[model samples]
Target: DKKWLGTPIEEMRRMPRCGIRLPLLRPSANHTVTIRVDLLRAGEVPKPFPTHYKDLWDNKHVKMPCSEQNLYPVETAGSRWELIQTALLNKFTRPQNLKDAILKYNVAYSKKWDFTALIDFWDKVLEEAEAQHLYQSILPDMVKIALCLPNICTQPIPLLAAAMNHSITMSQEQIASLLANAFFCTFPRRNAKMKSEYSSYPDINFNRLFEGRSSRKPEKLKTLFCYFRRVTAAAPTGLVTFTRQSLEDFPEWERCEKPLTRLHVTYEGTIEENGQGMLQVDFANRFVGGGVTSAGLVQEEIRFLINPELIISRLFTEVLDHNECLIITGTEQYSEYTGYAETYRWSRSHEDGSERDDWQRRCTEIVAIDALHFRRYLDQFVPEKMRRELNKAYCGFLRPGVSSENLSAVATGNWGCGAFGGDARLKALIQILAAAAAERDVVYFTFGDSELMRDIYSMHIFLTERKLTVGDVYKLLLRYYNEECRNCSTPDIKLYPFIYHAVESC
Candidate 1:
């Protein structure tokens, strides 16, 4: 094993940076969650420079307290709950402006409540207006999603009014999935916790709603589900997206152009003698022979998780070709300062500027793949694909003689669900099954040209014939890399390094 060099740099980081830990939906009942926020003094701690890694927390977890802890007597632990509760009660008690009041409160409460309540309530508000014939249908979806959850969700409301009315048959599972999806329509994603700033972005909250927990409480889960159903007459019965329907519309770029996946040579090297720092090496030394000159240019991702269907699978597949068309670079960023050994950022800009968000320039079109506009189109395709795979993977995971695939372990789990009861275990398993299934969809949807051919021009190639358990494969591929990658020669390494760098740096 040339060991001095070759390793897969792209698929290294395994832990989810942000969206992984957020709440996916509301409990049909009350939810009791313990959100821990920690802050460590930067200057001089008892431990080494990196030992202070445990001190950092997500912006959402830390900012809430920094803003309110000093003003009130609430303990750091209790403050978020208190603030969220007060905001909710305020909106509920003051129904005079149920819509206005809910929209006004800017905090975690917006994601937790305004989203669920706004659309549900708006249906009635709009109905009243329509009864008086004062309401026009021009922006029905916008009114339901935008005006209602102004502080929570926007654009794609995630409600399937047209689908539901048009459907001949829908089941509980479908309804649950739809309602669950709606709740995420209000997802609140924040790049940083200075304030509820992301509220201005359409996809931030829209994406936030569906980011579910590995371990969720029934009370909280029930509370959330009930809130949506209580107000809306029809419970959305299916969870879906236009990713497939949309991706299909795009031409197959991956076929004749470039590989579906690509890795740019960010940095390649080994530790220096005496271990002072890392020694950089040329990309050729790692893969292509040094004699080989002019490897194709390496670049950063254009659009990530771009809802494959909206841009390629369905929407604008014909507008571009594979060689020059947009492709997502599935890379992540991390802070060396955090020193968690595994921390990384995903879907954000790469500090190296290699794959600098070219999607912004090349994408050319921005159609509404938002849940509301593309719901039926997505529902028509994604579910069937998902259902087919989950059924197969879940059945296979269960050993021979193990019948009734009602239960199985999850491949990827986060949060603290292992500490609880059977319900927790079941929920965890379902979440994993869904996750693996989703991962498959993501991979499958990107096939052909939409898979982003240009992004894969000049990196090493390592492929496994058979499927490895998702978690196991992730850990295995992550094992590639020189340990000294963390202290890369390039300034970008200061931001995030492949796990090899993390392990070596540690």
Candidate 2:
């Protein structure tokens, strides 16, 4: 029933004449634990090596018997343990004068068995031990030695070849997670999530040009949203009341690359109906305009719509960079909160009075994630949540844009720009991707108009052939990406498939 049932038996010290025995507990059927051990013999083991290409460097090609890139981390851990042993020995050898004191006392035999002298020696040793500075001086070489060991070795050719030939398939669930992470990274967070000051102007009787505009008979709109351009929402004393200076001090939208009035799909819906345009305006305002609180006004107010597509797109980029999953936490701080709301309005009006009706509300935040990339690793192992997130991300693109009213009709199966997805083109593309993924020494996927699918296929081949776990592959890919896809390798990143294959060949 105990998680550490066997460890303590070996960890405790014992006298020479004393024998240590461990106690085991038997639990009820409802509570159970099983221990398992498997011993592998050298000759009996089949050589494990890579049989496919695993290079991200060469046009994201599949490198058969992926090159040296996974050894560094393994070796470094080993070297760290060795340093620990050496440090232990160094601690036991202290008190040079105590050794002499024993000799002067004609207590040479006592020196061997003298507990007091030993204790004194260890006392000074412990003082050194308490100061972690020793590890700083001692661990460098150990880490270097550990980090380099994996690089020096070569994998066997036979093992490499076998790994290449063995076909491995991943569930769609496995693949979808990567897509979700990518979506999350590429998606931009709404500016409305930024903190802002808001206050209610109660009992102010004014002309209701827009009847029922701010007059929700029962209760007023307690919250509002906006976009941000420069200033962040870091501090708030009480009720959020925006001042003229605060509005001016806030960030402004970029002048260039004009914001789309709305996103439209002719085959589907309108911008306002789909909320695409509204989301963009709202999200941008959050960064440019501080978020709103209870603000009372007899007339209309403002709320900005957050662009879901933008945020999801950014998340996707982080995913492609191999960041697993971002840990999202809800926070009172605008920076930590993220979500969707039904409505928001923009108070700022343009010369054409277009923005007057442009108020949008849905907004959310990305919080406490080191970078939203780690989720990729998690998706590999746990897929259900990954798929859901991915579906939400992609589906967001389908929302109608503001300008869709004038868009032309779309034919069935029209793949963006009529480039593909028709009867003939669709068939060809599917065949190509399927064949590439099914290939013996290579793998690839073709979807949409990009390289995203193919890269995943290539990565799969590299991991399988090299006997690298998902975690291992992630770390390697991260290094490569970080190093700008250059020769960014250490022992930790080398794929030992070739070395294993070579041994098997022998």
Candidate 3:
């Protein structure tokens, strides 16, 4: 049975009294297809209140991800939906206009609906209609409303600062407003092709998600709506920071003398669940959230699904490099999810009670590093591949000139093991080596791979017993490469045999 938007495809094909056309594939046009809706009434739109944090706009000195001193505090009353309603009506000048604009796509709602509730109901309606390809006509009014919504932060959040030293603060109300805007599909000029100015940024526009009636859409929307409800009820106070760092120089594997830092391996909960207060890893693509807006949905996409607010980072974050990683601080995880890929579901609200820092931000931090997408498994065995992986991991794990006092352990699992076609043992050791070089502890989550958990655990014991420094492991990898070259018939090198051989030589 085929599925779309978590419903049966056959069920979707059965529309009542309408001729619907399903565009199974993406259309030629990149822009959102407007859905015309007639609410069958008209009234004056409400005026929007002035922006509370006016300093955030046009203030070059107040860069995003800046020192806490740079963040300007602003006050607001009411929920996030209220602020968005005010902002939208401020632009359109009529509740009926907003109602008509939203309802034209056959949403089941009257003018008495709350704006946020309307959005909640509208998401379901659109999911069903879109599955059947019913909302094809252009509804420019909703797009205009989306455009009228304000930017969350007016200034660029530069990532040049140390990851721990930076933080960006926004009231829960502010976060809610930004999300409501996203929920309404308001981000402008996001559907451009690769050459467009915004191509470097992750897709922030929700239009594509609104159109596709795949098993993925409702799960994503569930996270978004749940987040809005949570934030509106009790907005997250304090600040959050997002940082991106690039490696100026790769780790000198030839030097070979940094002792192993620390390692904790397990096959239990996901990195996000068990890695709280520690630095979490997002196995991302070069483009941050990685096809979350388009058709693709995998580890990174599911990550963004649960933490929908992270999608906001894509609006301002630049593209990443093999020598670079993106670190996000204090972004709340709003929804709990079960399963991976097609089995993924929005389970429930996740109440994060992680402690706050002196800067009034949560201790939660996440690092995003893309692994090499090796088309051929053999291609990853090259020294250059090893070097790139090592450098990328080091770039994320190390912060130059920063003290290790507050540097938490890295929590990661299967960094490039899935679609990237990477060996778990190889990637795990690569991260261990990088962490050792950075002098930070590592907690590896196996994501339920029991055999991997056991293999990596035993391998760690062998390497530790031999007291192998990171450089020593590097040399061992070189030897392993030589062995591979010498014996083409030799099976792929397992960490245990290599460590056993190295221990004997020592």
Candidate 4:
């Protein structure tokens, strides 16, 4: 009966603190989200204590609205805010105004962007039944999302870009407000290339998802379009935390002598669909969201499509370093997707009644780690490349500041194996080794590939039987790699056979 790891799901549930029905709630500490309604003469549910206003909006690489720069060209009817409110708030006159208002505010790239895909989606994508519903019903809420900016966010927002590691915990309303501005494409100066202030950052606006070519771009936008409808209606009032963490040093793999940790390789479940309480890994692009906004619909993109809150991380998160990973706590699943890549579709609404945490976030914890692309397959054989992969997984698997006795199993699989040309057997060994060091069990999903699942399962079984420690396994792989790879222009043998051959011969 004791099958689960980490905190039990039943124990993680808590009622939401902020939302449509309830009064605005927040932590006494300024570290929590600051919504516009935190005032209004209603009692603060969690009780707020004043801090230096500077501590709230303090100087940083990025700052939120209350700074005044975001609201300009300052109003006297001169501001873009005036144009935006008139363009959107009461006027859902036509869906075209959403684009015109957005382009009016973001004039820098008004001509630079195109709407062929959006037009195509509107013309052909949604079921004939749903398209009219979108115009008559949904587009209004979409503008509501844009107009609510003045109501939701009153506090200074901190953009969590590449600097040092920092955590930003915002409520559902705050994220919704942030995303609303993103919908209208209203945030200033975020356009353009390396010349822009956030050049190194990912696209924060809905522009990329809105424009671009017509592949799954239609599907991606509709999925996002679907998310906008759900949140504006009920306002779940949950909490979500995005933390970018980096490790300064790596585990000295050559000499550390820890035993191999547990493994559960199977063809069942998905990182988002099935991995509930354990840490879910996003086999991410170093840029974090990869192509969630575009035609890209691999694992990471699909995860973002379903859990749109994770998409917010891209606005400030720098391209992930080899030593870094992104952890998201408590964002609810808002949509259900049915297929992959070209077949990707917006199925229907998802009702997430999952357990919440004390802070009102969801129980699910998702971690994003980027893996190296090995086009030639042999490119991954480079010793330094292998070491970087090792550190990347450890950066994701290691849960610092948490007790070792309650380590959560890592739910990841085939990590770099797909478009990146990574060998699954090689990746399986790399992940379990990192999980071993971190003292967490592994639940590896091979995406319904039975043979590979069986192969990885038996390899773990065989290695455990051979009494090999993770260090011994690392040392053993080094010899096999050196022995088998020196003469070949590309990969010569699969990882498991070489390991078995090396172990038996030694």
Per-candidate RMSD vs. true structure? 25.0, 32.6, 15.9, 5.5
Model 1 C-alpha lDDT per residue in residues 1-506, reported as the tens digit of each score = 12112223333222122112323322111221111112112221111112211222233121121122313333334443233334333322222343343333333344543233233333433346432221232122222322322122111121111111110111122223233223323222333345453322212222232222211122122223233332243422221111101111221111222121222221122111111111111111111111111111111011112111111111111112111111111211111111111221122212212121111111111111111112221221232322332332332222223222221221121111211111222222222333343231111111123112222221122221222243432332223212322233432221122422433354
- Tens-place lDDT digits, model 4, residues 148-239: 55555554556655546777776676677677677667665566675556666777777777775667787788778778888777665677
Stretches of candidate 1 above 4 Å error? Answer: 1-484, 489-506
Best prediction by TM-score? 4
CA lDDT of every candidate: 0.22, 0.21, 0.59, 0.71
Candidate 2: C-alpha RMSD to true structure equals: 32.6
TM-score, one value per model = 0.20, 0.15, 0.70, 0.87
Per-residue lDDT for 121-213 in model 2, tens only?
234333574323323432232223322222211221111011021111111111122122121111111111231311111111111111222
Range of the 10 consecutive residues with the lowest summed lDDT in candidate 1: 273-282
TM-score computed on alpha carbons, candidate 2:
0.15
Task: Using lDDT, rank the candidates from best to worst.
Answer: 4, 3, 1, 2
- Backbone Cα, N, C clashes tallied per candidate: 52, 117, 9, 3
Clashes of 4: 3
Report lDDT (Cα) of residue 357, candidate 2.
Answer: 13
Q: What are the per-residue Cα lDDT tens digits for candidate 3 across 407-486?
A: 66777888988678997888999998988888777788887777787787777777777787887787777777677634
Candidate 1 vs 2: which has more lDDT: 1
